[PDB]
Design a protein around this nucleic acid. Structure first.
Ligand SMILES: [Mg+2]
Ligand SMILES: [Mg+2]
Ligand SMILES: [Mg+2]
Ligand SMILES: [Mg+2]
Ligand SMILES: [Mg+2]
Ligand SMILES: [Mg+2]
Lengths: 123, 58, 35
RNA sequence: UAAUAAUAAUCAUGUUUAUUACUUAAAAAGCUUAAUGGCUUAAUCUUGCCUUACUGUUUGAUUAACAACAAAUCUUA
RNA sequence: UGUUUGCAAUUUUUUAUAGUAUAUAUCAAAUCAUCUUUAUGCUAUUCAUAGACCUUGGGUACAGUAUAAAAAUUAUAUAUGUAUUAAUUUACAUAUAUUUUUUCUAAGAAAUUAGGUAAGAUUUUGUUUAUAGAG
């Protein structure tokens, strides 16, 4: 009971009748937030257009490569489109071992570790 | 007259998380601990590090 | 506040008086020590 | 760096959990109780404020209610 | 002084001024319970004050990297140690409680409520995919 009463007190401060009220800004305060909200959503637009511009440029570099490759005769006696048809195959792309977990598991960090990189890694 | 509900969110802190590799990053959580040291995580697990021999005991 | 003003006043006012005779009996404790 | 042509993308001045409009067979669920019909653009559901589930009189119909009359049903001022 | 504290930002209305209908201010109502002591307390430091580590207290602090200068201040009954004064006055320190600040035992965890009106929502059933315990 004493431990359960402690839980119920945690749900009491979260009651709709006890949580803090909606903010009340004056004008100069309301306009300062309107200016900060307008610059944040603009910063997000710039980061979006940049983010999406690079993706479109990577995509076009792939297209220009896979368009040339589609019209290449070779190597040797292989006919036109061979390498192109071999590059468009998706064998193993949608399986369990598609992306190595040593690469995906390494998410970014604010500061590096004691050993940032392991040059002594051996096969 | 559809009610306009309000959000009921508990107090959230900013926490520093130190993985087993010594790397650090900041998160947002409800626990008041300022620094969370992690001794066992994905950086020290053989299922996430299949090519790490230090963690391989055979 | 002012209720504690006169208190801190009266207490210290006569506290020094309390030790005016503390000096005295300690003074006669010396000349009485002699001979 | 500019011009021209071609190709691709392009709702977005907006706290992407976007938003908005249109579209998504039939049956079924729900709508006081069987069955039938109907409603999804409301007759269902949710919420707010309410009690017109009011008083008197009254119009036009039910191819002149029930192949008469009466008790009835719908509707107008 | 209700309305967030740096400044004509919602709707309608009252009154006043200018003005010949408009313009500004103002007032009320609607929408919303935002919490408001400018410090009286706390904190740090120093000194008197005993003297082998004590009470009570007097100054100091100068605040945008805001600050000691309010992270939340009420009131009461009993009894006690210290000290007080012409007082169980006062402050201190507790213990026992009772208290306002609604601010700490989840109704936004419960009830199948069926009519009027207004707004909002628009496949809710079944089938099917997956999902600790879980068949
Ligand atoms: Mg962005
Ligand atoms: Mg109904
Ligand atoms: Mg209703
Ligand atoms: Mg007839
Ligand atoms: Mg279903
Ligand atoms: Mg199962």
């Amino acid at each position: 009971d004493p431990r359960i009463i402690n839980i119920l007190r945690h749900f009491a401060v979260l009651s709709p009748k006890r949580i803090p009220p909606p903010l009340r800004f004056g004008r100069n305060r309301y306009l300062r937030h309107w200016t900060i909200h307008r610059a944040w959503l603009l910063f997000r637009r710039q980061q979006r257009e940049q983010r999406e511009r690079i993706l479109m440029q990577q995509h076009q570099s792939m297209s220009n490569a896979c368009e040339e490759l589609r019209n290449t005769e070779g190597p040797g006696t292989r006919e036109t489109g061979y390498l192109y048809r071999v590059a468009m195959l998706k064998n193993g792309v949608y399986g369990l071992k598609s992306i190595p977990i040593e690469y995906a598991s390494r998410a970014l960090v604010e500061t590096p570790g004691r050993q940032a990189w392991n040059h002594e890694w051996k096969r | 007259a559809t009610f306009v509900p309000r959000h009921r969110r508990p107090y959230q802190f900013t926490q520093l998380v130190q993985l087993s590799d010594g790397s650090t990053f900041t998160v947002r959580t409800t626990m008041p601990t300022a620094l969370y040291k992690s001794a066992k995580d994905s950086r020290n697990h053989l299922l996430w590090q299949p090519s790490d021999k230090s963690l391989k005991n055979v | 506040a002012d209720r504690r003003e006169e208190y801190r006043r009266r207490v210290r006012e006569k506290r020094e008086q309390r030790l005016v005779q503390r000096k005295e009996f300690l003074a006669k404790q010396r000349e009485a020590k002699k001979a």
